[PDB]
Design a protein around this ligand. Sequence first.
Ligand SMILES: C[C@]12C[C@H](O)[C@H]3[C@@H](CCC4=CC(=O)CC[C@@]43C)[C@@H]1CC[C@@H]2C(=O)CO
Length: 478
Amino acid sequence: SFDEALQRVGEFGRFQRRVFLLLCLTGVTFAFLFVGVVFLGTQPDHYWCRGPSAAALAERCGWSPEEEWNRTAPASRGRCQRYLLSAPLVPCRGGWRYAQAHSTIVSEFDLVCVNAWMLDLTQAILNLGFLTGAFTLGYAADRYGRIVIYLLSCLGVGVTGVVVAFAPNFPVFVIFRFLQGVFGKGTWMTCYVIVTEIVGSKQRRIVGIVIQMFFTLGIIILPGIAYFIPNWQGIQLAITLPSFLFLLYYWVVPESPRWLITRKKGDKALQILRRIAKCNVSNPSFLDLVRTPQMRKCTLILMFAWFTSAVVYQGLVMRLGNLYIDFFISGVVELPGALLILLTIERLGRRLPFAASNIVAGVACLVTAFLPEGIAWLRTTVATLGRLGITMAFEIVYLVNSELYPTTLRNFGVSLCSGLCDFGGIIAPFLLFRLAAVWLELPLIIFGILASICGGLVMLLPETKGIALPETVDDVEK
Ligand SMILES: C[C@]12C[C@H](O)[C@H]3[C@@H](CCC4=CC(=O)CC[C@@]43C)[C@@H]1CC[C@@H]2C(=O)CO
């Protein structure tokens, strides 16, 4: 059986540790990608418009632009207003300047008060790219090989990073950031699938948890790496460079054997086992994804949980809010929860800590809803506890999701769940604003109820414990 064969080969070897380290480096690069948007756009100290006579005056006073800021309209900075030479203070459209030496995307692309809509639209389009990337890349990875798709996706990530680094204007930047998003989702998700596939079904929990740990390590390094290489071109190039180095290695990290032995070849899979022995269906379909009743229910609850967790996390971070030390603290805070799951699993069921995390997040949201005019410390710590619970939820969710889906289609359904998560990420801010206009703290209550029903629902899962991985239709064990 596919279990005895993997038993003959060492479950954990030096080669497996090396490929794990390489794919964790891929994961931290992906983490660099997602968190790049915030630091990429930092509002400068000031900005103001220019006029013809104003330009003539600045020609004699171009040095020390803060002098021009002191002399220019204070908006009554900038509030996108301009002076026409009790003088006319009308808004403008061009001739903007910035006194901040730290180059930013906002300064280069001239994103202003009437133009911050596209400042948010950059992130929105990135989420849309993530969604379509999951959608297309799951099918592409199921049809073709997995390793070849990862290397191909990484190539695209690198070229997209370079081109958005050297983008002349806005629309090309937006389109190629969309392409970067699809490629990044593909490479990250394939990397997760491959690390889950290579290892046997006892040390998979540490595999997923440590991948998460490397993601947290990347967001941790993000604040530290940002202080040096200030030029926005520099940080963008630093983000995109490791993708090429990942593309560099092909001989290591071979094709997954379990996926390979699916009647497509079989003989090739045996050769791969010998290579790692140094130490000692035309295509996937939706209708097949949903046709089975119990599998349909499992899929529906999984996508529901992805959606609710993503939206409550987005709401909580929006409620939360320096520019480097705060990011560093947020990075380090995430580690103890991941350690908590790392220690907890194999002593308890997998669905229980997820349900506990969802209940904790809902309770935290409900508590933060009340006492609006009280002290800030209690609301702050309760919101932080809810956020920590919701991240703990994410790590637990990735492992369970990978187990429920069958091996004949693994990257397919998980991509759909990730796509619903991305869609919730897109739709969160509009819902937040709409439900906050009527009355404050109402979205927090709604998200608390949503998380409560989510945690109640997860109890219907088949506990995904000690069953290894299911083959084709054997998924519906129950
Ligand atoms: C929440 C984490 C950061 C971020 O939130 C991740 C999440 C994994 C799923 C995921 C995929 C996306 O397409 C958007 C980001 C995100 C939703 C991560 C799990 C651990 C990690 C952290 O612990 C860092 O906060």
